[model samples]
Target: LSLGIETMGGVMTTLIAKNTTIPTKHSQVFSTAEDNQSAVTIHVLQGERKRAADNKSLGQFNLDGINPAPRGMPQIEVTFDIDADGILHVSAKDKNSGKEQKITIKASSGL
Candidate 1:
């Protein structure tokens, strides 16, 4: 299965592309859309669509408590991991503050 996230401009940024080998992890850095943005919404999605809204949303969580900074200054790393059991795990962390948040989606849990 494919895995990605919704970023700025309502675009789908693929972390784990289609047909990728299982039990893998990928990390991508993203920046804030506005100046002094103190929080980020990690919108997890799955699909090959160009538009974020067209893709299927697995789930979403917030990574808050980001230090006040200018736009595009903070280095926020988002990691996507698929385990041997076919479960998807996603985590977002702020590099400066070390704040993190995660979410898990199970394949057999009736998505």
Candidate 2:
């Protein structure tokens, strides 16, 4: 889950943006970077740049188990959400095999 969370897309991307309502779940569609790619990665970031790598990596996950397909073929859907507890919940579900993966991110600073 990202703050300005915008994937803008290359693979699973910019599903949500800032000023969004809490408990909101935003989703976007994406495809593989290469053919037969079994795994994909998602990174949470703070908005500044349009590219995900250009920003900070708050957290991420590399998900696999998607059926092999040509580049830009397999579709992966990712969701960015903020719950009532202020925790970031990013979920990815491969549309092919119903494979699902979820990651929870907590924001913190000084102890």
Candidate 3:
């Protein structure tokens, strides 16, 4: 069981690899795919699949209030933290606007 995230291009970006220890934290930076994008929807995924659609969705949340800018101009930092109990905490923050969002996902049936 690996930890991944859905990218703007619908690809699975690995965060925590399989067989890795829990209570782990990882982060990645992403930019908007379209110019003047108002918001970003972070989709949490599970599995090692290349395509995001093939992976199991853990949960998702939107980070609003982004400062309008050209595509790739604004940077958003996404962080994933998993605790020992298997609960997942995801956070997204807009570096320019200081806007942020958070979500918690519990372990699902598949593991």
Candidate 4:
């Protein structure tokens, strides 16, 4: 069981890969789309689609901070992990400020 991302630009980003060890955690970095973005929206998704708009959005989370920086300046780290029971745990961190958060995902497909 795995999940991945396929960008229309022919860039494939795998959030989870096949044959990957379970109960594992992986993190990736992303930048803010624009400057002075006080809050950042983290979009959690599962699927392989050319565009994120075509994929299944799992959830939307946000992180707020005192101030914002220029576009592509702030680095957002996203982490994804899976448990023994195949449950997924997601987390995000501000690499520059060392702020972090986590959440457990419950699949609606009855597991």
Local distance difference test values of all predictions, in order: 0.67, 0.57, 0.68, 0.54
Predicted candidate 3: what Cα RMSD to the true structure?
3.4
Candidate 4 residue pairs that clash: none
User: What would the per-residue lDDT of candidate 1 be over residues 1-111, giving only the tens digit for each residue?
Assistant: 566777777888775644357678866565544334578776777666788899888687877765336444666766777776766777777776767778886544332
TM-score of each: 0.69, 0.61, 0.69, 0.58
How large is the C-alpha RMSD of every model relative to the true structure?
3.5, 4.6, 3.4, 4.7
Model 4 is weakest, by summed lDDT over 10 consecutive residues, at: 1-10
Off by over 4 Å in 4: 1-12, 29-36, 66-76, 95-99, 106-111
On a 0 to 100 scale, what is the lDDT of residue 111 in model 1?
A: 26
Clashing pairs in 3: none
Question: Candidate 1: worst 10 consecutive residues by lDDT?
Answer: 28-37
lDDT of 3 by residue, 1-111 (tens): 566777757787776554247778866554444334577677778766889999888677887655336443666776777767666677877776667778877653465
Quickly count the clashes in candidate 2.
Answer: 4
